[PDB]
Design brief:
Oligomer: homodimer
PDB class: immune system
Chains A, B: complement factor H-related protein 1
Keywords: immune system, cfhr-1, cfhr1, FHR1
CATH architecture of the largest domain in chain A: Ribbon
Strand order of the largest sheet of chain A: 2-4-6-7
Structural class of chain A: mainly beta
Number of strands of chain A: 14
Radius of gyration of chain A: 20 Å
Largest interface: A-B, 17 and 19 residues
Assembly: dimeric
Shape of chain A: elongated
CATH class of the largest domain in chain A: Mainly Beta
Entry title: the structure of the two N-terminal domains of complement factor H related protein 1 shows formation of a novel dimerisation interface
Largest sheet of chain A: 4 strands, antiparallel
C-alpha cells in the first residue's frame, strides 16, 4: 500500500494533457488521469478516453492498450474470422485450399502485441 | 452505374492501401479512421461495397472531442466523449470566459470550435 502512484507508463498509450506532467512525479491518491490508445490499439472498454484513478493499490482500472488484428479474407483459403476484427489474446483458425498450407506448428494463429503470430496466408510451398 | 470511383475518405485509411481507377460493382474494401476519428458504427475496420448507388455504407471518419473537466468552470459534458456535430455548454466561474463570452462550444472536424477553457 502507498500514499501515491508512480506516473503511469502505458505501452501504445497517450495521456490526456501529457505535456503538462513529469514522468518521475509522485501522483497523490485520488488523482484522475485519462488515457487513449494509438492507432491499431484499443482500451478494454473500447472507449476512446479511459479514466484511471490513483488508489492505495495503484492505478485503477489498470491502463492497457490491446492490439487489434484483422484480415478481410484468406487468398486460397477460408476462415470464419475473415472480415472480423480480433483483440490481442484471440485465436483464429484458417483452412487452406488443395495444394496450399499455413506453415506453422500451431493449430491456431494468435493475435499478439505485434499483430498476427503467423501471417494469415495460405502458401503454395 | 457499373462502377464506383475509388473512395476518397478524409482521415481514413483503406486496408492494403499501398497495393491498389474505376472499381467494379460488388467489390469490397475495408476502411479505418486515423487516431482521434471514428467510423459511424465505431468499428475499427468498416466493410464498404461498391453498388449501383455508390459505396455502401457511405465511408466516413468523424472527429471525437473530449475534456475531463473545465478549470474555473463547469459543464455537464465534463469527462464525456463527443462526436462531430455535437454541441456542448460551458459555464465559467466569477470572472472567466471561453474566447470570449461564447458560452457554448461544438465538436467540429478540427476538434472543439473554441478551446474548452475558462480564462
Amino acid at each position: 500500500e502507498a500514499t501515491f502512484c508512480d506516473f503511469p507508463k502505458i505501452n501504445h498509450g497517450i495521456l490526456y494533457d501529457e505535456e503538462k506532467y513529469k514522468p518521475f512525479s509522485q501522483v497523490p491518491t485520488g488523482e484522475v488521469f485519462y488515457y487513449s490508445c494509438e492507432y491499431n490499439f484499443v482500451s478494454p472498454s473500447k472507449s476512446f478516453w479511459t479514466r484511471i484513478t490513483c488508489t492505495e493499490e495503484g492505478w485503477s482500472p489498470t491502463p492497457k492498450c490491446l492490439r487489434l488484428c484483422f484480415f478481410p479474407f484468406v487468398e486460397n483459403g477460408h476462415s470464419e474470422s475473415s472480415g472480423q476484427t480480433h483483440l490481442e489474446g484471440d485465436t483464429v483458425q484458417i483452412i487452406c485450399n488443395t495444394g496450399y498450407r499455413l506453415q506453422n506448428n500451431e493449430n491456431n494463429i494468435s493475435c499478439v502485441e505485434r499483430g498476427w503470430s503467423t501471417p494469415p496466408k495460405c502458401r503454395s510451398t
